[PDB]
Symmetry: D2
Subunit: 283 residues, 4 copies
């Protein structure tokens, strides 16, 4: 039906690969080696708008990452293919990507990769628990999985300024997130710019529910959160990001005081059949 | 009334700085230290759409880097401020950026920087001369400078695959560029995908003339061309990139066979007064 | 009373920090904040030869990493202080280093750091199990712990060429290691250049036994093995490396066909008292 | 009969390459393509001790970068081969290195590279002029060129903390260098830890003269000085570094307050013959 992008216990490590279609004529050999490996559990697949446009196919609901003319920076770095590796072994995830690069040889070239890890049981490097208000069980299926079993994922690589965020008094940190670090209690007196106040899923006229599967990351670029939002469409994520960016009321999310996204991508996660991944509407 | 963006001898070195508005309340102290240094000759200034939106001001013609839903990737990495340092001394430009970072420290944080150099007298790292068909003297002023003396610049950091491009036969390299490497003579029988055929300035519905001030670059990200396009508006550059991306006729520029842009930005270069740079429209 | 550097189950992640003594006048304040944190289990401490020289103290058995005039490269990158972080949470080790850098900010500066992880249950990224012939229980204490509670540690960051090593036939890989990858069986007819043949602990005039606590690593520098050898002295490690380098018989270890060390350091791990780590001899 | 290691006008840019001998069996094919390109002016060659050790040859005066048991850190990062590219075009030097990697492909692999540039006319990024007391003309030949026309070069990649050093008062900066930044006047009352006082070439019982051809550098590792010291032997440089490290009198050079070396290498620059560079002592 769907890919296992909602599996309850999240593995300790993840690796997100992003490929650019450098040689579209050599695409058939790449798909012959990739598709038998896409089980939706240890290796998940996402199709970008450039890949659909290059093959002359239109995927309903698929479009590139939007362009927000706001006072904050939300870059659009749309790629052709997104590979999401999951597993408890960090080195195993590293060796699979090296094999995936060779198997995808001339058609697709690696444009970006993220060595992600689950901090604690699902906490940001700032210490705050993330995933408290994520839909669970069937309501996660209703909010993240479309009718045909497919999902629409948005990815953003947020870079944290941990030194500055920890320089603030604890009351300033809690007012930025909207939750108390000591006990994860929601602050009902937080300013409207608080992240929890900006992204309250029930505070939108169409309820902007979504399933978030974010993990932490750290390399030469710094450290932060690899944000992943899964939805039955992109409308949930996009209406949240527009309000965080101040495009609705003029109030900008407090996250931008210490963190900014480095990348931005929209990807269509194809449905699963009983005999593997179903990429038919494209293939 | 314009910044010296057309100076006849291009200095041997350039340095392009891109800043993110991290703390908008501390902007006045940043502007007090920055504006006395903007002479338009050794330090040029460009205003991004995020900076205009944060101050609640609308500059006619200023908008973020566009989002092209094409089969090739032209990322949109719009920042708030662009500082363009020019000079013959590479170390002098480096020490000036360190002073500029410290002086703009809390309001603006450095998001990206490019150590550019003029290869030979104005050649791309592939060996082809770039700037052959650039307008000069008064025709350059009409194509790059608006009525109020301001200019609208588009920036792209292209990453070259020099090993692959030099692996091609010399006839294939000339057909990708559209010009003969041996004598810079235009190949009149090159395919429609040739770069010169894609960007023929006289072949556009309104003549899409522009002044290009590109330089080479090389660091840990690789090597390529720091593309800078100056126009009286963004319509010249944008109609060129849309045709290069196959959005007009379906034919994609041959440059994408060996090079792809890593960044994309639109910036408004304010006019010059007799008493320094004129930012009044935005104060 | 030794530091817990021999605990049988190795945590999933490690972090090796290396500091240079930039400001000796601020050293006492740095030690006042650091030494209460050295428990020898989650945070272990190693003293380098430069630190002993700066305080005018001589530690018996402490000397810098040697200089091997061989046909292979074993660089000597001796630092003043070594901090060895252990834990199952990769992000916890990251946030600890940020706090350790700030607390040691003026006296000691971070010269190098390694984000290490235990691959599978203790395998190299090439797939071979490492630690098969490591002494255990009392034999580990006899080989790694001196008469006092102290130990002498050697550190090397080996960079692997996994693409080249995996390109070789499996029989060629096994002849380099000296063991069969399929079943970890020792090859009794492997060439003398095999690693196991070069480092056979029982083949030295005094038996050169040692406890190895190496982990894998991967960052912008590549990927490989963070080699850690603990001994009652440096004579065990040093006599192994000289034979691996061909300084004994002229035969060079097969490891240098696909791997090379990037760093090299000798560090004295002080004993533990009931009141924390015991730096008496150095005061 | 020597490589153009003393040419008076230094080109605006340099690129120092360092190679590791990964596959000795493909070394003859690598040397066949490299040696005809070494003219000693735009491309200079330096032989490391591992390369001589791999060929079973002993070069008199060639040894790895030394091991200094001092209170400061001078790492020894000895490589097999050193290629020193010089030229006024930064991009030309980049394209020649990519071709050199392919020409040296399986035998030698690039271990480290430095994109160097001549700051101002010969100034450090701190602003101080470097090369003031460098020997010139024939006295440079006497100090840097051996009898057989060969030279022994020492290389160090120093990383500067410009933010910290420039935060200090100018009197503190001048006391570290031993010279006044405002007019390059030598401070005759500077502390013994001053760099000029530590490295005073006439203050050694055998005069430790050497020709320095350093350039600035800046990349992801930071910024500083790519230090290159040329001598008729390594004894000049080595006795200077021992004093800077406090191994002679216990006084450490003030440079270590804001800068530290990241690499260290000894390289033998072979003489030039009528038919190019002369590696005979290595290739009979
Ligand atoms: C650096 C980036 C981010 C960080 C550190 C972060 C952190 C957090 C934390 C700690 C919570 C509270 C725990 C929870 O309910 O999950 C939260 C909630 C939430 N966040 Fe984020 N977040 C980030 C980015 C985003 C983005 C880009 C979006 C949407 C475009 C988003 C949407 C949400 C939503 C919908 C909730 C649940 C709010 C509710 O219904 O109570 N987050 N986030
Ligand atoms: C890797 C990136 C690029 C390279 C290597 C490159 C190189 C060149 C070269 C060698 C020429 C021929 C010499 C000349 O007439 O100037 C040329 C022409 C030109 N290019 Fe580019 N260019 C690049 C990107 C771009 C982009 C992104 C645009 C526009 C969006 C552009 C617009 C033009 C124009 C307008 C001309 C002049 C065509 C004419 O009127 O004859 N270039 N370029
Ligand atoms: C890239 C670097 C290295 C790798 C990948 C590596 C890997 C291995 C492997 C696979 C084994 C066989 C399994 C075992 O008995 O533990 C082994 C054994 C051993 N290694 Fe290493 N090793 C490396 C470096 C070194 C160095 C530099 C030394 C000493 C200077 C060393 C000392 C030993 C010893 C003493 C043994 C046990 C040999 C025996 O008694 O059978 N290793 N290593
Ligand atoms: C960060 C590293 C270094 C910097 C910034 C630096 C800079 C300078 C400066 C500004 C001078 C004075 C001007 C001149 O006479 O050229 C100087 C002199 C000198 N330096 Fe350095 N230098 C560095 C490293 C070294 C090292 C490592 C050595 C030797 C091991 C050395 C050897 C010398 C000598 C011999 C002199 C001439 C002293 C005299 O006779 O007056 N330098 N250097």
């Amino acid at each position: 039906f769907q890919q296992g992008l909602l599996a309850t216990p999240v593995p300790a490590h993840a690796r997100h690969l992003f490929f650019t279609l450098q040689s579209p004529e050599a695409l058939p050999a790449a798909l012959d080696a990739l598709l038998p490996q896409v089980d939706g559990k240890q290796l998940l697949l996402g199709v970008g708008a450039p890949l659909a446009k290059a093959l002359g196919r239109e995927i309903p609901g698929l479009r590139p990452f939007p362009l927000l003319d706001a006072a904050v920076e939300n870059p659009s770095t749309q790629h052709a293919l997104w590979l999401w590796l999951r597993g408890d072994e960090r080195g195993d995830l590293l060796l699979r990507t090296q094999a995936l690069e060779q198997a995808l040889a001339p058609a697709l070239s690696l444009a970006d990769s993220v060595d992600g890890f689950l901090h604690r049981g699902g906490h940001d490097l700032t210490g705050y628990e993330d995933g408290t208000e994520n839909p669970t069980d069937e309501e996660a299926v209703q909010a993240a999985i479309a009718a045909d079993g497919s999902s629409f994922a948005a990815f953003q690589l947020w870079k944290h300024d941990l030194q500055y965020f920890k320089s603030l008094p604890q009351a300033d940190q809690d007012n930025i997130i909207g939750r108390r670090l000591s006990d994860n209690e929601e602050l009902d007196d937080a300013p409207a710019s608080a992240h929890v106040k900006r992204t309250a899923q029930e505070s939108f006229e169409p309820e902007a529910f979504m399933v978030r599967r974010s993990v932490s990351w750290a390399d030469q670029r710094g450290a932060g959160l690899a944000f992943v939002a899964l939805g039955k469409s992109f409308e949930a994520f996009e209406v949240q990001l527009r309000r965080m960016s101040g495009l609705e009321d003029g109030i900008i999310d407090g996250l931008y005081r210490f963190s900014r996204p480095l990348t931005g991508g929209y990807y269509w996660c194809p449905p699963m059949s009983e005999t593997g991944v179903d990429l038919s509407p494209l293939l």
